[PDB]
Structure 1
Amino acid sequence: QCGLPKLMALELFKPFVMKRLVDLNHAQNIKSAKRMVERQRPQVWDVLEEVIAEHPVLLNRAPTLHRLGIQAFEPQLVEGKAIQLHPLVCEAFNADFDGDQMAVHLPLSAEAQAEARILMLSSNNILSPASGKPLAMPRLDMVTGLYYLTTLVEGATGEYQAATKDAPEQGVYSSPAEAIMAMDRGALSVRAKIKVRLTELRPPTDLEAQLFENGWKPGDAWTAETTLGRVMFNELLPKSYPFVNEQMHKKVQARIINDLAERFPMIVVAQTVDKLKDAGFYWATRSGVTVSMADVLVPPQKQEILERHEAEADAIERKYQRGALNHTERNESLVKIWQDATEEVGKALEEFYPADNPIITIVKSGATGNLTQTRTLAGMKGLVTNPKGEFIPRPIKSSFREGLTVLEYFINTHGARKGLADTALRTADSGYLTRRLVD
């Protein structure tokens, strides 16, 4: 589906609604029908919903790179003048909500609508027709939203205690619906290690063999130890699918969704990814993931590492200032001294950040971000290239958390501009190539 501004939809379908409201007594002749739509008499809207029903439309966003750049959807009248786009198709369209626009086309002939619903329908195209990998697979929020749900926390609230002596195990629940009643109260934590009895879910292949081996369990109860979230996670997958019981990285979700397309019909993956979306968002907001000057940490070893390599350069600079050193090797020595010195801060930085820090969880789960990106935010930004392409031996010691200096900022722009200019002519050339490949 897609959100279609009601004004836009009225004009697109204007000839259709004109006939429908003349068929009904609303308008006596086509002339009246035309004016009735132009001035937007309130009667048309109930008519528009009928014509639009199960009548697809094509949505394009330029530039169109692969055929996935055009996809059919079922229109839904929406309030406002903007267009509502499903969050899973942003990957194919390369669509940012920074203010991009999209085009709508109305297939008319029976054949055109057939091709829309069948060939180009949104849910039928999931994997990219290049690598076969899944595209509509969740990303960004939905990643960190699920990664939080499935993750297992040691010493959480209500954790199964493996009780001894005077008390029974204490970590068991009659059913999942009980773990929810325990979660609503402060008893249970969604990330807890407790073990539950599950009637409606399927155990893993291995354990299913030892447990039953006479068949599988639609109603047959079995017990495993998993986080309450991992339970709810597997309720999103098909009832026939085995219990994964893992914390979901992006690649792990790729493995799973990739597998569903082999063992299950398209319509099944279409609905399973819809369910991952709703779940991922809900937990993305409950994830408690924000940013702050506090949540940005810098390693205390940065001072010693920095001042240490400084003398190593000053000594090599003293060796070059002594006349013996080769000028080309001097900078090369500095470039090597500082290059791997950045790795140390990167190593020290990772050691410092608690695994639950919101900045790293974003990169860990594979939702978005890189480590090289979080290395310039805190710690050091590193060396920057000169205009000629050579590496400026003067490193940037400060990080964008502490802020750069007057000269540090002027130097970074030297490189930062060359990169942004490249992206300019990288699209113009890449498109000229594609035009020759196509021909």
Structure 2
Amino acid sequence: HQCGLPKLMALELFKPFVMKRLVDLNHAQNIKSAKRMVERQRPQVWDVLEEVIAEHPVLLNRAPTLHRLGIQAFEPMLVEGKAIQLHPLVCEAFNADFDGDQMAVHLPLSAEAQAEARILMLSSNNILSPASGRPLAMPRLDMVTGLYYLTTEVPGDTGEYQPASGDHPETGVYSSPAEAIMAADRGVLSVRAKIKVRLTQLRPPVEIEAELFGHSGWQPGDAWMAETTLGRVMFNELLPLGYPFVNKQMHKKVQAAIINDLAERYPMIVVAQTVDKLKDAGFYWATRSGVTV
């Protein structure tokens, strides 16, 4: 729901609001001197600017506008530099490549215009294609790669679960996912290795939940033994609490199916936070996926 706004750009766009709030406080004697101070970029204007910016939406547009998602409303935040910072999930909607593409900002003034921006045109309020209903703000490119690297199962990977043949018991089992993270901090466990973890905080799939927990549904805190990789646990923790565990290598199609399902059965804000969590994880693991030419 946010966009980076260059400081000087925001100061010019919001100039009257910054002047009014500048005369409310005693920084400016009157409104004309306030204009003189904003034009000169006196240091007093940055606190006030950050104040008036708050929860005041702006509209971003990239030409050509093919469909209404070509214009979207964001909450601006003061950012360093002269470039507008755009969220990676809306690029698909804007067809925004960063080759030098430019975008336009518009400041809604009246209470009705601001309300329409916050409600009708807000970025996180439109996740889905108005045409096909499929998710747009869905992950793509590096993000996909990261998640795909995270949820892949590598046979023979470090710390792989072992049958416990011979004189020793099972070496691939962990009491909690936190313990598995501790093992991965040392060289002992690979994020992509097949293991067994006891999960309290994640919902089991349909078959395992009906078999183990019977008629009574699963509840947070109830432990169950899962056979997966630690990466798939970290991925499922990005999904909403109480979502049935998905043990799969995450292709783009699988992520699109999960987000399609969340759009149908879940509130819009839940989806909007889920795709952001998937974003951070997908990028972080994209840099560590080793993809190179």
Q: Structure 2 length normalisation: TM-score? A: 0.98
Give 1:46 deviation, angstroms.
Answer: 0.6
For residues 159-211 of structure 1, give each alpha carbon's deviation from its aligned partner in whole angstroms, at most 9, with x where no partner exists.
00111120101110010000000000000000001011000000001110000
Give 1:217 deviation, angstroms.
Answer: 2.4
For residues 397-437 of structure 1, give each alpha carbon's deviation from its aligned partner in whole angstroms, at most 9, with x where no partner exists.
xxxxxxxxxxxxxxxxxxxxxxxxxxxxxxxxxxxxxxxxx
1:221 corresponding residue in structure 2: 223
Cα distance in structure 2, aligned partners of 1:190 and 1:216:
26
Give 1:288 deviation, angstroms.
Answer: 0.7
RMSD of the alignment, in Å?
A: 0.6
For residues 123-166 of structure 1, give each alpha carbon's deviation from its aligned partner in whole angstroms, at most 9, with x where no partner exists.
01011011100001000000111000000001000000111120
1:76 corresponding residue in structure 2: 77
SS of 2:194 mapped into structure 1: coil
SS of 2:77 mapped into structure 1: strand
Give 1:285 deviation, angstroms.
Answer: 0.5
Cα distance in structure 2, aligned partners of 1:206 and 1:120:
40
Give 1:240 deviation, angstroms.
Answer: 1.2
Aligned positions of 1:247-326 closer than 5 A: 247-290=249-292
SS of 1:120 mapped into structure 2: coil
Percentage of pairs with the same residue: 91
For residues 262-309 of structure 1, give each alpha carbon's deviation from its aligned partner in whole angstroms, at most 9, with x where no partner exists.
11000000000000000000100000111xxxxxxxxxxxxxxxxxxx
Cα distance in structure 2, aligned partners of 1:122 and 1:36:
34
For residues 212-250 of structure 1, give each alpha carbon's deviation from its aligned partner in whole angstroms, at most 9, with x where no partner exists.
032212111001100100000000001110000100100
SS of 1:72 mapped into structure 2: strand
Cα distance in structure 1, aligned partners of 2:225 and 2:275:
27
Give 1:91 deviation, angstroms.
Answer: 0.3
Cα distance in structure 1, aligned partners of 2:276 and 2:19:
36
SS of 2:197 mapped into structure 1: strand
Structure number with bigger Rg? 1
For residues 59-102 of structure 1, give each alpha carbon's deviation from its aligned partner in whole angstroms, at most 9, with x where no partner exists.
00000000000000000000100000000000000000111000
SS of 2:237 mapped into structure 1: helix
Name the count of aligned residue pairs.
290
1:115 to 2:116 alignment? yes
Cα distance in structure 2, aligned partners of 1:45 and 1:133:
41
Give 1:3 deviation, angstroms.
Answer: 0.2
**Gap regions ≥5 residues in structure 1:** 291-439
Cα distance in structure 1, aligned partners of 2:152 and 2:258:
16
Q: Structure 1 length normalisation: TM-score? A: 0.66
SS of 1:236 mapped into structure 2: coil
Cα distance in structure 1, aligned partners of 2:36 and 2:219:
63
Cα distance in structure 1, aligned partners of 2:248 and 2:219:
21
For residues 103-131 of structure 1, give each alpha carbon's deviation from its aligned partner in whole angstroms, at most 9, with x where no partner exists.
00000000000000000000010110111
Cα distance in structure 1, aligned partners of 2:216 and 2:69:
45
Cα distance in structure 2, aligned partners of 1:8 and 1:198:
49
SS of 2:11 mapped into structure 1: helix
SS of 1:158 mapped into structure 2: coil
The structure that is strand-richer by fraction is 2
Cα distance in structure 2, aligned partners of 1:250 and 1:166:
43
Structure with more relative contact order (C-alpha pairs < 8 Å, separation 6 or more): 2
1:137 to 2:138 alignment? yes
SS of 1:113 mapped into structure 2: helix
Cα distance in structure 1, aligned partners of 2:30 and 2:192:
66
1:183 to 2:190 alignment? no
Poorly superposed stretches of 4+, deviation over 2 Å: none
Give 1:9 deviation, angstroms.
Answer: 0.3
2:95 corresponding residue in structure 1: 94
For residues 25-80 of structure 1, give each alpha carbon's deviation from its aligned partner in whole angstroms, at most 9, with x where no partner exists.
11111110010111111001111011111000000000000000000000000010
Cα distance in structure 2, aligned partners of 1:83 and 1:173:
46
**Gap regions ≥5 residues in structure 2:** none
SS of 2:120 mapped into structure 1: helix
Task: Select between 107-116 and 212-221 the one with higher mean Cα deviation.
Answer: 212-221
